[PDB]
Amino acid sequence: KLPPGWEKAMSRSSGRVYYFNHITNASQWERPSEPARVRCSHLLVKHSQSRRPSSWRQEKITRTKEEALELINGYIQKIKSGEEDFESLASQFSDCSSAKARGDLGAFSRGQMQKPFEDASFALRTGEMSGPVFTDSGIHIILRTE
Numbered sequence: 001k002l003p004p005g006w007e008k009a010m011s012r013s014s015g016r017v018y019y020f021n022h023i024t025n026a027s028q029w030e031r032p033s034e035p036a037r038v039r040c041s042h043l044l045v046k047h048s049q050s051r052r053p054s055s056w057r058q059e060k061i062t063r064t065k066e067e068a069l070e071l072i073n074g075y076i077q078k079i080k081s082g083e084e085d086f087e088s089l090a091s092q093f094s095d096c097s098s099a100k101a102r103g104d105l106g107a108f109s110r111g112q113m114q115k116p117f118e119d120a121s122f123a124l125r126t127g128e129m130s131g132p133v134f135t136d137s138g139i140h141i142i143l144r145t146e
């Protein structure tokens with residue numbers, strides 16, 4: 001039995017099975033391996049429909065949801081290939097002020113964060129990273145650190 005959110009799927013290009021998580025939007029070839037609090041970092045990319053279309057990076061955020069998702073997807077690719085660390089990309093590109101702490105949000109319990117972010121955070125095991133996670137803030141890559 002796979003951990004919460006995890007399902008088995010089949011690659012359309014290769015035919016090999018892989019696993020994906022409908023809570024975190026994580027996807028991976030490898031078969032995957034609750035606390036009161038978790039600690040996470042996150043890289044946020046805002047779009048024009050974000051609850052506040054503004055950040056420390058850009059006074060007015062005009063990119064579309066679709067453009068934001070492409071950016072998030074490129075960052076996940078660089079992180080997964082090891083070309084860049086999550087921390088480096090968060091510091092340079094995240095629209096959240098936690099960028100200045102390499103994305104770190106510190107520790108939190110259920111009841112504090114936006115719900116899709118929270119659910120993703122608590123479905124990650126320590127060390128694991130989400131796929132694109134959508135909230136009223138924009139699109140997040142989430143990394144569970146504790």
Ligand SMILES: O=C(O[C@@H]1Cc2c(O)cc(O)cc2O[C@@H]1c1cc(O)c(O)c(O)c1)c1cc(O)c(O)c(O)c1
Nearest residue numbers: 008009010011012013014015016017018019020027073
């Ligand atoms: O539906 C296929 O792709 C989906 C749409 C799509 C696209 O439009 C452009 C692109 O860059 C990637 C891409 O990934 C999609 C996709 C979805 C899956 O669930 C999947 O397992 C996969 O390998 C891929 C598909 C079917 C195929 O039969 C196939 O041989 C293939 O290589 C791909």
Ligand SMILES: O=C(O[C@@H]1Cc2c(O)cc(O)cc2O[C@@H]1c1cc(O)c(O)c(O)c1)c1cc(O)c(O)c(O)c1
Nearest residue numbers: 044046052054055056057058094095096097098099137
């Ligand atoms: O401009 C942002 O903060 C404002 C300026 C600022 C600063 O220069 C240094 C500092 O120590 C704190 C600080 O608080 C300001 C602030 C203003 C608000 O109206 C607000 O709601 C808020 O959370 C905070 C900002 C951008 C962001 O992108 C962001 O994620 C964020 O939380 C905050």
